[PDB]
Design a protein around this ligand. Structure first.
Ligand SMILES: C[C@H]1O[C@H](O[C@H]2[C@H](O)[C@@H](O)[C@@H](O[C@H]3[C@H](O)[C@@H](O)[C@@H](O)O[C@@H]3CO)O[C@@H]2CO)[C@H](O)[C@@H](O)[C@@H]1N[C@H]1C=C(CO)[C@@H](O)[C@H](O)[C@H]1O
Ligand SMILES: *[C@@H]1O[C@H](CO)[C@@H](O[C@@H]2O[C@H](CO)[C@@H](O)[C@H](O)[C@H]2NC(C)=O)[C@H](O[C@@H]2O[C@@H](C)[C@@H](O)[C@@H](O)[C@@H]2O)[C@H]1NC(C)=O
Ligand SMILES: *[C@@H]1O[C@H](CO)[C@@H](O[C@@H]2O[C@H](CO)[C@@H](O)[C@H](O)[C@H]2NC(C)=O)[C@H](O)[C@H]1NC(C)=O
Ligand SMILES: *[C@@H]1O[C@H](CO)[C@@H](O)[C@H](O)[C@H]1NC(C)=O
Length: 826
């Protein structure tokens, strides 16, 4: 039998007397036994959510099906031959329903007529049909192969940021190490961005399937096809047309990136295997002796009593010593983050288990708590869809925090990971689904090393449907526990994620390896998590698995000092890799962490921008240069903010790197006299000695920096130095957001914050540098001072009333007081 026969339009109508939506009823042409029962009648709606977002929702006309609950991911409710067209005068997107047999639909741009999503079937080829079976949804669009450049569909390790043609991407959260290319990893993000090189260069849109079920997405260059094993089609198309606008639109739907406290941009140290409190104190002390900044010390599962959450090893990490350790960190302006796993050990004398049982908080299967295996041995898993389990989790965190202060939490193993695979329930098509997704690259059963699909959650929800939400739900509950126990802005790092997780948590790339490949893989993954609305992202510096080398670690701290989340972490069976252990690594770390710390106000401003509009901190070159098609395929360079580009060495033995430079003039942030100037964008062979990484700022940008220091608190008390990079063709601008670094509501109505905008423009004989300030009172009360301005990008010197560098020193200006400074040429 054929896979399916598709659907015909039975009726369709655009609702008059309203900002139009379109409603249609589809009927199945013919049943097929392949992949299980076809849904006979579908309700099909297309509607505009905003002018820039089109929503296409396809459900069973006669029965409710699983959808991600509104409480989990709040969003506007669904709307209340021949073609049927839907358009709005203030929308660029035009929707068309084609009454062919089988039927089709397209979305195109009113302005350019470019077709963005084309689900018109090829009548002879059922692989192109919409097929809608209880456990097999198939939706396919053709694509213009050479002109469509796609990014996203995480989480997967790949050597390229742009998706390669001819691959299958599987979304099924799994405890599979990120050192493995291609395989489905810890998170599922069914979003892609499509940048078109033609007809209008840089025209971008986004496509999101809001569905938490397992799926395979097959991309062959001229087509992309979703093959989803449950749920509904609830497809959102975001009009763009710039890549930035796409992410603003996408995060408006899934949630804005959470704000992060200023200290989370400091350097973090962790290792699986630290043996006792004396060892972690020694590591903190050695960082200080090496003069390498260290902001946060982390403890992995070693700190627990026999790997049990909410306990301390009474021999190796005794409470009195841990309390002294944390008090000392805090006296020195440092912070402490411990790990938590979701599985609760089943020991009848363990207080956490006793309380979990009393509140009936655990996931069940066959009516009994589901017994998994993780680090402490036998565990039950809290059901984070159950309000009682969330209350339990809040209470356990409160109890532990009351005994040992903490500054944030790292939540791991929350796919959920299970070290055993349970036998499938006989006869269940959930544990034995008719279509097998490409789990682990080998069509491995979905229950492998996780909680079985037939396990049940609050509201009679199956693990089959809710699996991909577990990590996301635990992050919501964990952030709530932190907010309920401290008035500071919280900090959370989570392994497993789903679309929307960025509203609650940071992420890291997971179990990478100390390999040169993985050093490079960290860049596409960092860029992808920006697109996923999770801009606080990084990889374990020097590599988690396998022993690192001096050279790899030196090149990795050079790159990793620029990740939004910068942490050295390592597995227990490997050589130690704290940055002070090799002199060449330590010397490089001091240099690059020095620059990162000077850039703290800039990272923090970019965090504020990400929370406001979804724009990532670490971004692809084509976010700033979308009209430059040469940037679309770059995977080994990235921007921090608009105009700073990092071009790392990624090969052993190299003392140069061939790096792409977009049109214009670029200046090294490590030596302002070193510059690159290109006309048409091109590759430049940058010198990159063992102790150096290339980081350049482009003309047209102004960045406010503060001084180096050993802690971010100390850094905030230093003077500001403004770096102004002039351009011959456009005025230069920049922005600085300031608050106390820890307010719950960032930029809220309380007004405990200031936003400064900087401007600079050259006349024929003068130069004006100025600022404009919103809420001057607050920055004034914080005493922030701008004592220097450096001006790059001109070929003549300026003073107060080849390229040269002009420095205006001794200013003593309050950052809170708007200024206008007039300079003259020499
Ligand atoms: C520590 C890590 O352990 C577990 O994962 C490891 C597997 O047990 C190993 O067998 C090995 O599996 C890889 C095979 O060697 C390779 O041939 C290929 O099949 O890929 C396999 C990996 O999928 O390596 C795995 C990763 O080291 C466990 O599943 C994983 O969750 C553990 N990592 C977390 C645990 C801790 C300790 O609390 C944290 O330090 C880490 O940051 C966590 O991510
Ligand atoms: C549940 O937790 C108990 C408290 O730690 C465990 O019993 C204790 O195990 C210690 C470490 O293995 C051992 O030194 C203690 O003498 C003993 N304490 C008590 C109060 O019995 C218990 O461990 C299991 O049961 C004991 C009797 C021994 O046979 C251990 O070897 C067992 O692992 C924990 N139960 C389970 C299922 O782990
Ligand atoms: C800096 O120079 C610019 C010109 O490059 C000045 O702008 C001109 O000012 C004169 C009066 O002094 C006007 O008649 C011209 O029409 C202006 N030109 C433009 C383009 O607007 C500017 O005033 C100077 N700034 C200062 C404070 O000296
Ligand atoms: C900075 O760059 C210039 C130009 O190559 C060079 O002469 C100088 O020695 C460099 N070193 C410093 C001072 O950082």
């Amino acid at each position: 039998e054929a896979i399916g026969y598709g659907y015909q339009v039975k009726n369709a109508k655009v609702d008059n007397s309203t900002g139009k939506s379109l409603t249609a009823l589809l009927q199945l042409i013919r049943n097929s036994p392949v992949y299980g029962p076809d849904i006979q009648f579908l309700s099909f709606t297309a509607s505009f959510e905003e002018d820039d977002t089109l929503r296409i929702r396809i459900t069973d006309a006669n029965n409710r099906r699983w959808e991600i609950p509104n409480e989990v991911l709040p969003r506007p409710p669904p709307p209340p031959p021949t073609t049927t067209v839907l358009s709005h005068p203030h929308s660029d997107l035009v929707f068309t329903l084609f009454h062919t047999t089988p039927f089709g639909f397209t979305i195109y741009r009113k302005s350019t007529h470019d077709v963005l999503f084309d689900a018109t079937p090829i009548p002879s080829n059922p692989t192109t049909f919409l097929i809608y079976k209880d456990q097999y949804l198939q939706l396919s669009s053709s694509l213009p192969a050479q002109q469509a450049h796609l990014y996203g569909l995480g989480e997967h390790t790949k050597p390229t940021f742009q998706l390669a043609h001819n691959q299958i991407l599987t979304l099924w959260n799994a405890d599979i190490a990120s050192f493995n290319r291609d395989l489905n990893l810890y998170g599922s993000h069914p979003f892609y961005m499509d940048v078109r090189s033609s007809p209008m260069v840089g025209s971008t849109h986004g496509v999101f399937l809001l569905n938490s079920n397992g799926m395979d997405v097959e991309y062959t260059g001229d087509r992309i096809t979703y093959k989803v094993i449950g749920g509904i089609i609830d497809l959102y198309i975001f009009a763009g047309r710039t890549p930035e606008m796409v992410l603003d639109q996408y995060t408006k739907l899934i949630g804005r990136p959470a704000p992060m406290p200023y200290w989370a941009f400091g350097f973090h140290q962790c290792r699986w295997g630290y043996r006792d409190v004396n060892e972690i104190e020694t590591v903190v002390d050695k960082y200080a002796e090496a003069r390498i900044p260290l902001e946060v010390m982390w403890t992995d599962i070693d700190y627990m009593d026999a790997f049990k959450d909410f306990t301390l090893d009474p021999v190796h990490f005794p409470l009195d010593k841990m309390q002294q350790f944390v008090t000392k960190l805090h006296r020195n302006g440092q912070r402490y983050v411990p790990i938590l796993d979701p599985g609760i050990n089943t020991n009848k004398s363990y207080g956490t288990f006793i309380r979990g049982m009393q509140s009936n908080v655990f996931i069940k299967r066959d009516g009994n708590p589901y017994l998994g295996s993780v680090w402490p041995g036998p565990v039950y898993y809290p059901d984070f869809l159950d309000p009682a389990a969330r209350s339990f989790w809040v209470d356990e965190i409160k109890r532990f925090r009351d005994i040992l202060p903490i500054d944030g939490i790292w939540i791991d193993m929350n796919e959920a990971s299970n070290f055993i695979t349970s036998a499938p329930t006989p006869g269940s098509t959930l544990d034995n689904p008719p279509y097998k997704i490409n789990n682990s690259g080998g069509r491995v059963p979905i229950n492998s090393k996780t909680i079985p699909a037939t396990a049940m959650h609050y509201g009679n929800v199956t693990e089959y449907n809710a699996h991909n939400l577990y990590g996301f739900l635990e992050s919501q509950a964990t952030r709530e526990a932190l907010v309920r126990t401290s008035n500071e802005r919280p900090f959370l790092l989570s392994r497993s994620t789903f679309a929307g997780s960025g509203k609650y948590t940071a992420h890291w790339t997971g179990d990478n390896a100390a390999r040169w490949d993985d050093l490079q893989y960290s860049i596409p993954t960092m860029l992808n998590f920006g697109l996923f609305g999770m801009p606080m992202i990084g990889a374990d510096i020097c590599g988690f698995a396998e022993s690192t080398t001096e050279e790899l670690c030196r090149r990795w701290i050079q790159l990793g000092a620029f990740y939004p989340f910068s942490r050295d972490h390592s597995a227990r069976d490997t050589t130690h890799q704290e940055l002070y252990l090799w002199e060449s690594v330590a010397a490089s770390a001091r240099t690059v962490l020095g620059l990162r710390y000077q850039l703290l106000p800039y990272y923090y401003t970019l965090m504020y921008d990400a929370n406001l509009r979804g724009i990532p901190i670490a971004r692809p070159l084509f976010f700033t240069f979308p009209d430059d098609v040469a940037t679309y395929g770059i995977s080994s360079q990235f921007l921090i903010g608009r105009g700073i580009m990092v071009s790392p060495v990624l090969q052993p033995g190299a003392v140069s790197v061939n790096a792409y430079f977009p049109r214009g003039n670029w200046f090294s942030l490590f030596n302002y006299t070193s510059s690159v100037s290109v006309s048409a964008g091109t590759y430049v062979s940058l010198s990159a000695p063992p102790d150096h990484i290339n980081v350049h700022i482009h003309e047209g940008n102004i960045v406010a920096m503060q001084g180096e220091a050993m802690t971010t608190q100390a850094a905030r008390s230093t003077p500001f130095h403004l770096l102004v990079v002039m351009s011959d063709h456009v005025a230069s601008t920049g922005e600085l957001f300031l608050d106390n670094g820890i307010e719950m509501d960032i930029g809220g109505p309380g007004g405990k914050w200031t936003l400064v905008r900087f401007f600079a423009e050259s006349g024929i004989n003068n130069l004006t540098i100025s600022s404009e300030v919103v809420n001057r009172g607050y920055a004034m009360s914080q005493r922030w001072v701008m004592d220097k301005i450096t001006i790059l990008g001109l070929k003549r010197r300026v003073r107060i009333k080849g390229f040269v560098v002009s420095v205006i020193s001794d200013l003593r200006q309050l950052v809170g007081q708007a200024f206008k400074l007039e300079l003259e040429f020499e």
